[PDB]
Structure 1
């Protein structure tokens, strides 16, 4: 009864988090806009008291799913627009991308024989990095809709802190609709498979997919034949993500969250998952150090100059407590470098005891500028990077964790190849991307079938 006495009396910014923050705020930050510090601060104070885009418990749930991906028990599908725009942040467009991702995910689930975690580039992807600050004419470059406008005028191209507020509005409108669609029938497994059969039936390359597709259909009819109810099959979770880029916006969305135990964590609640770009990943700079002090799952893009030593060093900075799926390493190497560079990256990282998600981004290392002056990517080069990624993983015995692709559910003419045989002269028909060339609906579905076979092997 010493515990009887105690129980009656006991009845009747924090710590070094502020250290790490000021250290992080001190650091150099690549790819930032030049705008008034006073204006920027006033906007940050507004955004500090608004509702976040996601809540912390959603982020703790994603973390358990990403751990399953890392441990070999699930696959990650990430993708969407290269860059969202406020003009294109519309119901029909968001719906087109959500459907497309959900459609790709059913095929991939069947081929992976594992759950697929569905992560959209959405509800925040409004900042893009640029090589120079000015155009050929001394006109400030478009830096995404959170900084300036697309229109090639000096008014439009001015860097405007208030666009952070427009971006937050558009992002929450967008996440709102993503949540509504996925809970009200758009994420229905059977409706989704009806849309995939139409894809196969109407494709000029349908004969390439019909057999895998008949197989999936027999798998679905089987489920129902075995007396399996509607239950989990009527809805699904889509997670938002974007490049953590604009310092003022990402700091303004930092939130404290306290969990089941009473444990207190710092989250960037502008998205479930955030990533660090190729051009913003200096180990001594803001972005890498910011991701290292937020609790959100994190991605990092690595190009073909990456060395294994550098890979290990990031893994140590970003996953310091050895948490599976905390860190996703996003290999974007080019189709001709992937087989050469990645093996040694994976080996050093695996040997160092980190269990990261290994993800292929077959888009950003396979971009070229065609005769007619259009930035484009060839379907075959995109497929071959992914295919090379899988070959490396099969050779090493490691897990091909996921893909990250830029696509839209719109019938655009942005990337060459696929079943429609899109060539140089087709590109100006319907090129709508505000940044990089995206796979169209047809190319996205083709890729899901092909990556399904990669998984099946």
Structure 2
């Protein structure tokens, strides 16, 4: 039997040490009384869409922040990241004739797993930065001592963000007639800004053709579906935002539409797996180089006993050198046991380089290589490359080569997100041809 708190009985990684247990309890509790970020019916809709992807009739586009922060909470940043998602989706949908399920790593992706539980600088040792939901980035005691009030600040930032995202998606910003205005200024001059300008003109032509045919009024051209997701890492936050569906009595984690378990917290006997095991959400698990096929099958027996094709997204993050060696054996076990999974590629988290400095780098070319290989590997085994899962930004920076080089990892910029979409689009077209 499961309950929203049965995770507290399991061994657990990556949890911060709070100075005041009773204070923490009071905040968990204020938060239990706050409205949910999502409605359970919506999470069932995403499951429905997941089952399409899993059967080879759609593709999953998941993208957003490494880890959102309190210091960067603006409409502009939310809007520009959403623009990049719309761009990518429209490119894939059109070139490949393929529905694309849109999931933002947004409105709740605050917590960070870490290698080390603390950090040392010139003889001083303090608790590690675990994301703004837990503590602050600044190297000083007050910043680093976990503050449970941050749970609420993270909640508030999330309702503001999701509220605006919902409004963009339904209220006209995502209307296909706005296809041009989704290209960010940044993508000004490359051949790229121009490969998209043509695709966009085509879409204009498509829509002109439809009004000429008498289809100018379809709501499906004016709005789109948009879902949110984050790593369920801080189980305090998740529990508090876990609610029963009134219609079915079934528990959903209503902090977001989809939750996923990290590579460092996926212990079969651990708290994170216990938590997500009993919620009705569609969910994911990060699958890195350390996963063998036995563990994988056991993990699936726990997270998808009924072998439902809408339930479980396996997010493969191997590294461009390792994907070829490791993935196949994993696909083959799944095939052999007749399991229904959605396979996605996280081509970022297994390609980060951390130098003694503590400085992180990602070569964008490695990122493309892992993707290209993920598609190759699925081609060969007779299975479906279902999804992509990336960190990206609408901001005008270049973080990958080809706060985000230390505590966080480097995000794709808009140019890079687009080249990737074009690449994915061609491959998908070939798959379907």
* TM-score band, normalised by shorter chain: over 0.9
Q: 1:392: Cα distance to partner?
A: 1.1
TM-score for the superposition, normalised by structure 1: 0.87
Does residue 454 (structure 1) correspond to residue 427 (structure 2)? The answer is: yes
2:54 is aligned, of 66, 70, 73, to: 70
Question: Who is 1:31 aligned against?
Answer: 14
Question: Who is 2:179 aligned against?
Answer: 192
C-alpha distance 103-230 of structure 1, shift in aligned 2 (>3 A): farther
Q: 1:205: Cα distance to partner?
A: 4.7
Q: 1:72: Cα distance to partner?
A: 1.1
1:416 is aligned, of 382, 387, 401, to: 401
Question: Who is 2:88 aligned against?
Answer: 104
C-alpha distance 378-338 of structure 1, shift in aligned 2 (>3 A): same
d(CA) in 1 for partners of 2:245, 2:184:
44
Deviations 1:179-223 (A, max 9, x none): 111122221112124544977762255577677666656555544
Secondary structure of the 2:120 match is coil
C-alpha distance 50-340 of structure 1, shift in aligned 2 (>3 A): same
Task: Number of aligned residue pairs: give it.
Answer: 425
CA contact (8 A) 1:411 1:442 kept: no
C-alpha distance 174-210 of structure 1, shift in aligned 2 (>3 A): closer
CA contact (8 A) 1:83 1:433 kept: no
Give the unaligned 5+ runs of structure 2.
none
CA contact (8 A) 1:53 1:171 kept: yes
d(CA) in 2 for partners of 1:190, 1:309:
49
Question: Who is 1:323 aligned against?
Answer: 308
Does residue 240 (structure 1) correspond to residue 213 (structure 2)? The answer is: no
Does residue 171 (structure 1) correspond to residue 154 (structure 2)? The answer is: no
d(CA) in 1 for partners of 2:185, 2:126:
46
CA contact (8 A) 1:97 1:409 kept: yes
CA contact (8 A) 1:40 1:248 kept: no
C-alpha distance 227-177 of structure 1, shift in aligned 2 (>3 A): same
Question: Who is 1:134 aligned against?
Answer: 118
d(CA) in 1 for partners of 2:216, 2:376:
38
Q: 1:296: Cα distance to partner?
A: 0.7
Moved more, 209-218 or 441-450: 209-218
Q: 1:397: Cα distance to partner?
A: 1.9
Q: 1:404: Cα distance to partner?
A: 0.3
TM-score for the superposition, normalised by structure 2: 0.92
Which has the larger Rg? 1
Query: Cα RMSD (Å) of the superposition?
Result: 2.3
Secondary structure of the 1:274 match is strand
Deviations 1:321-375 (A, max 9, x none): 1111200000000011112211121121122222111000000001114698641
Does residue 153 (structure 1) correspond to residue 120 (structure 2)? The answer is: no
